[PDB]
Write a protein that binds this DNA or RNA. Structure first.
Ligand SMILES: [Mg+2]
Lengths: 258, 468
DNA sequence: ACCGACGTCTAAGAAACCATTAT
């Protein structure tokens, strides 16, 4: 970088290079569909995946709730060194790392977690719309210096609801892991999103460079707690659990000069 | 959190009459004139009509509007005043006589009511039969499709536009289809500009071309179309090529990639033999159009990634002295960017009012780059001379970049970005400033759809004038 | 008995339909 103007992206660097998880050795072979069915039925407080053995992050009691003592031959530790290469090579590992990072990010915060098209979203709750941590986002979505609403009802809709949201994605590029943020509008229920296309277009019509920059800054501050500090924020997934994931994510979005 | 230094490609310059340059295509046409006006080809643009009895007044009205000046009403920051066909294109627009205006058969209405699209296309081509003997009396033929036929326009497995174009392709008859969209749009200047440029191009003229363009480089694009039937699905995967000849001119052709008919593929990716055959055809075309010389460097653009067989076939198809650059264009990406301005006196560093400039490219990895084919362009605004213009302002709050993946080549990103940006501005069918994708991909996709509709028009090379 | 059939998970796009028109 040598000179202005600068290009401010929406990618947040990830500094953590190694993660430590748990392995569940099973006496009987298990498929991904069976694991998903057991997860749905028992609803554990943990994150699980299956590349060649069951890889889990969280507490052992949750896994022992999913699998009986007879099925669990042993529980061990797996070191995913060079997390960028593992994410690039293994798709299941990529999904697992994305889920772990987002679970760490949205922990102990008043932000809902939602899934659409296998893409993760962070949604502002209706009850917590007036809280002070969202004042900057209210200002960003406002018009002519007036405070704007970040949650409401879709106009000319029977029971449709809308809220401000950001899409969080994990991306690997040349041995580097990036957390990708894109502001969006969440429409509840999900299956009726086609009924609010006009509302979404009207709300997003005048979100030009300045407004988008302000919205991105507000979302970064909401998700991480600090903005423009030049430092990194440490987020932990299941901190009390024996098998936990700790990530170091920079708070300054990737930029370029020249 | 600091990426590699980015660079901005200067906006491509378009060549007009008397070798004059201008970034704005419509403004350049208005002030200087079309590139082919110096060559007196075409000397005139004669028109023909193909519409029912009840709708020939609409064709007369649109031709009269084309012959008369119009003022912009929407997007005034970009569109310039239309001064009529003769004033802008320096050639007259001759209205057809009674023998050059044709009548749609009455069976067309019944066929459209019955929903048979293929019968409708057959009836239209049979109606236009009388003009085959008088092809010498006119240049471009106009088709009006009434809204009463809308049920036969596009349903599962049919495209009336593609079928009609494929049927008129081997007859060497350029056509221009007019619907109710062109007649009931508020901005008459936009429609007039688009239709006039299309008619001038289809008459045999070159509205504009790139200014600093190398004649030793050839550009190839591959795109695929999917047709689904009871047994399964088949892929068309047509091809396109862009280059100018040794003399003055501009070459834009598309051809099917199937070496033989009755060849069915289930994936867009080609094999070693198929790629070799297609690239041999491209090399033969270039050699024919360049007095038997070989291109010094070859560009191949694809929508999907390059397999090892494709790369090997490409490297074995050309000689050792020809440089080969394989680039994959990814339209959908997770990256988006915000423009931040520097300090200007007392004003601190703040985000810009207008988005990132068109032409900025950000090298991400050793093989991938982010190219901004959509963005703000300076020097094209008509209302405020110093204000940037963002073409997709009514559709996208912010531009969305495209990603380029390098599969072969030792050169830098500058040449590839310059080539793609330059090729995004030569779409004569497009009346706006630029296209998101290079024109090679657009033409390959259009020809893929046309071949998908009618597979009997393959194995013949066709010009862009018959499918735009 | 080595390969097929079929589930999971990404990345990327085509194919029908709707929509609006450039701070
Ligand atoms: Mg056209």
């Amino acid at each position: 970088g040598k000179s202005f103007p600068a290009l401010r992206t929406n990618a947040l660097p990830v500094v953590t290079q190694s993660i430590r998880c748990g392995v569940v050795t099973l006496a009987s072979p298990i498929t991904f569909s069976e694991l998903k069915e057991r997860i749905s039925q028992k609803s554990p407080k943990a994150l699980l995946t299956y590349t060649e053995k069951v890889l889990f992050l969280g507490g052992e009691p949750e896994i022992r709730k999913i699998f009986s003592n007879d099925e669990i031959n042993s529980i061990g530790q797996y070191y995913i060194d060079e997390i960028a290469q593992s994410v690039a090579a293994s798709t299941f590992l990529k999904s697992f790392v994305e889920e772990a990072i987002l679970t760490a990010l949205l922990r102990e915060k008043p932000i809902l977690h939602r899934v659409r098209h296998r893409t993760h979203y962070a949604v502002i709750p209706n009850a917590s719309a007036k809280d002070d941590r969202f004042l900057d986002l209210r200002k960003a979505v406002g018009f002519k210096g007036d405070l704007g609403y970040i949650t409401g009802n879709v106009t000319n809709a029977k029971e449709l609801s809308w809220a401000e949201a950001v899409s969080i994605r994990l991306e690997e590029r040349g041995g580097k892991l990036w957390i990708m943020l894109k502001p969006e509008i969440w429409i509840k229920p999900l299956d009726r999103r086609e009924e609010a296309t006009d509302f979404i277009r009207s709300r997003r019509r005048y979100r030009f460079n300045q407004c988008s920059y302000q919205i991105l800054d507000a979302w970064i501050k909401i998700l991480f707690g600090s903005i423009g500090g030049g430092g990194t924020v440490n987020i932990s997934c299941f901190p009390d659990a024996e098998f936990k994931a700790e990530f170091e994510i920079g708070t300054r979005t990737a930029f370029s000069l020249g | 959190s600091q990426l590699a230094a980015h660079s901005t490609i200067p906006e491509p310059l378009l060549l007009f009459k008397d070798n004059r340059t201008d970034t704005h295509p419509l403004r350049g046409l208005s002030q200087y004139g079309p590139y082919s006006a110096c060559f007196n080809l075409p000397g005139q643009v004669r028109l023909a009509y193909l519409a029912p009895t009840e709708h020939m007044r609409k064709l007369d009205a649109i031709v009269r509007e084309l012959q008369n000046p119009a003022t912009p009403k929407e997007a005034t920051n970009y569109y310039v005043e239309y001064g009529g066909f003769e004033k802008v294109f320096k050639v007259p627009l001759v209205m057809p006589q009674e023998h050059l205006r044709c009548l749609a058969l009455d069976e067309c209405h019944g066929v459209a009511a019955n929903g048979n699209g293929l019968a409708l296309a057959d009836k239209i081509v049979q109606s236009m039969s009388g003009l085959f003997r008088q092809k010498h009396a006119f240049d471009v033929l106009l088709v009006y499709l009434p809204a009463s036929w809308k049920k036969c326009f596009e349903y599962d497995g049919f495209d009336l536009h593609d079928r009609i174009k494929a049927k008129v392709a081997p007859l060497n008859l350029p056509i221009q289809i007019i619907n109710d969209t062109a007649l009931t749009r508020q901005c008459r200047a936009n429609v007039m500009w688009g239709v006039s440029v299309a008619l001038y191009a289809k008459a045999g003229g070159i509205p504009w071309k790139l200014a600093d363009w190398d004649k030793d480089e050839a550009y190839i694009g591959l795109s695929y179309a999917i047709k689904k039937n009871a047994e399964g699905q088949e892929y068309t995967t047509c091809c396109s090529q862009v280059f100018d000849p040794d003399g003055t001119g501009f070459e834009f052709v598309a051809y099917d990639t199937r070496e033989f008919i009755t060849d069915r593929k289930g994936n867009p990716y080609l094999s070693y033999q198929e790629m070799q055959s297609v690239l041999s055809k491209s090399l033969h075309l270039y050699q024919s159009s360049h007095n038997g010389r070989m291109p010094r460097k070859i560009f191949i653009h694809k929508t999907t990634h390059f397999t090892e067989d494709e790369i090997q076939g490409a490297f074995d198809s050309f000689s050792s002295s020809t440089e080969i650059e394989l680039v994959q264009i990814i339209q959908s990406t997770n990256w988006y960017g915000l423009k931040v301005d520097g300090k200007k006196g007392d004003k601190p560093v703040a985000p810009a009012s207008y988005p990132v400039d068109r032409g900025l490219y950000q090298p991400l990895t050793e093989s991938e780059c982010l190219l901004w084919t959509q963005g703000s362009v300076m020097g094209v605004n008509q209302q405020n001379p110093g204000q940037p213009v963002f073409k997709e302002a009514a559709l996208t709050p912010l531009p969305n970049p495209i990603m380029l993946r390098r599969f072969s080549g030792n050169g830098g990103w500058h040449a590839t970005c310059s080539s793609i940006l330059a090729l995004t501005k030569v779409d004569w069918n497009n009346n706006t400033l630029y296209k998101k994708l290079p024109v090679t991909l657009v033409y390959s996709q259009v020809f893929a759809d046309v071949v998908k509709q009618t597979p009997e028009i393959v194995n013949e090379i066709y010009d862009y004038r018959f499918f735009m």
